[PDB]
Amino acid sequence: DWTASILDQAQAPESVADFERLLIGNPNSSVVWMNYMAFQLQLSEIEKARELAERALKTINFREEAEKLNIWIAMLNLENTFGTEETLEEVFSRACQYMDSYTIHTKLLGIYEISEKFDKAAELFKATAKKFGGEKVSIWVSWGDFLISHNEEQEARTILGNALKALPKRNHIEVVRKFAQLEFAKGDPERGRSLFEGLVADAPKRIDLWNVYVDQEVKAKDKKKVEDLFERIITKKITRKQAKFFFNKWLQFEESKTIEYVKAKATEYVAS
């Protein structure tokens, strides 16, 4: 159960002797080590589960990186809900020294969100953006997600500004694109529209963006918004089979009266 949330974050034995037996045949299995740490936690044996984790890191084959990753995440969780800021910092410092620092940062961000320590999350987000944000688009998207879902849509947009200032130009389309999807999914779809309109305005040829745009409007389901978008799409330069793709999208959407206004235009372009 406890081990299920860690296996999520990372993307019948009943006694010490049972687990020690299972470890003989599966020394490299973090699920066994995690269930064993768990068993020792539902007994309020925190100092014993700490020991298991150190055994697990010295026992699991160093080639088995993903398995080692889970154990560190188990240690961060245990230290987060039972330890203290000093014990949590020691583990964090060691985990960053032994696993990839950035993924470890993002794991702690998730632990903070799950455990609803939002003050520490916010603070951490700013720190890891400061040191990985020059290279990593995701820190920005996930900070923006955080701010939007705590109703700080404004602060979200000023953090998108910071990303554009920190990221190289070839990632700008991606942040903005992903911040826009966020806006449609969780914040203000109107701001989502401004952002897409700005991209399309800068990359009029990039037909892939027009696609992401309309799909977002399809999911938002607003009637005139979707039609207005489709009619603007045709005037822009489309190839043969790509022009067909948009028609498939338009047809099966309006399906789910004016199902005729599209068919009469669907073959006027095979002609002209």
Q: What would the 3-class secondary structure string for 9-59 be?
A: HCCCCCCHHHHHHHHHHCCCCHHHHHHHHHHHHCCCCHHHHHHHHHHHHHH
Specify the residue for token string 């032994």.
Answer: 98
Smallest CA-to-CA distance from 211 within 178, 240, 249, 265 is with 249
Q: Give the separation between CA 102 and CA 83, rounded to whole angstroms.
A: 22
Please give the C-alpha separations between residue 158 and each of 16, 23, 122, 135, 155, in angstroms, as whole numbers. Answer: 52, 50, 14, 19, 5
Method: X-ray
Please give the C-alpha separations between residue 78 and each of 70, 91, 151, 183, 267, in angstroms, as whole numbers. Answer: 12, 10, 30, 34, 63
Q: Give the separation between CA 191 and CA 225, rounded to whole angstroms.
A: 14
Q: Give the separation between CA 193 and CA 226, rounded to whole angstroms.
A: 12
Q: Give the separation between CA 219 and CA 124, rounded to whole angstroms.
A: 33
Q: Helices 169-186 and 137-149 meet at what angle, rounded to 10?
A: 20
Q: Give the separation between CA 115 and CA 269, rounded to whole angstroms.
A: 56
The domain segmentation of the chain, as residue ranges, is 1-272
**Resolution (Å) of this entry:** 2.8
CB-neighbour burial class of residue 247 (10 A; exposed 0-12, middle 13-18, buried 19+):
middle
Question: For residues 170, 172, 175 and 180, what is the CA-based torsion angle, rounded to 10 degrees?
Answer: -130
Identity of the residue numbered 238: I
CA 130 to chain CA centroid, Å, is 19
CB burial readout 25-56, b (16+ within 10 A) else e = eeeebbebbbbbbbbbbeeeebeebbebbebb
CB-neighbour burial class of residue 190 (10 A; exposed 0-12, middle 13-18, buried 19+):
exposed
Q: What are phi and psi of 168, to 5 degrees?
A: -70, 160
Per this entry, what is the length of the chain?
272
Cα angle value 180/102/160 (rounded, 5°): 25
The first and second tokens of residue 206, run together, are 């990039």
Cβ 154 vs Cβ 121: under 8 Å: no
Q: Give the separation between CA 191 and CA 261, rounded to whole angstroms.
A: 30
Long-range contacts for 6-9 (Cβ within 8 Å, ≥24 apart)? Answer: 6/34, 6/70, 6/73, 6/74, 6/77, 7/31, 7/70, 9/73, 9/77, 9/107, 9/110, 9/111, 9/114
Q: What are phi and psi of 107, to 5 degrees?
A: -65, -40
The first and second tokens of residue 109, run together, are 């961000």
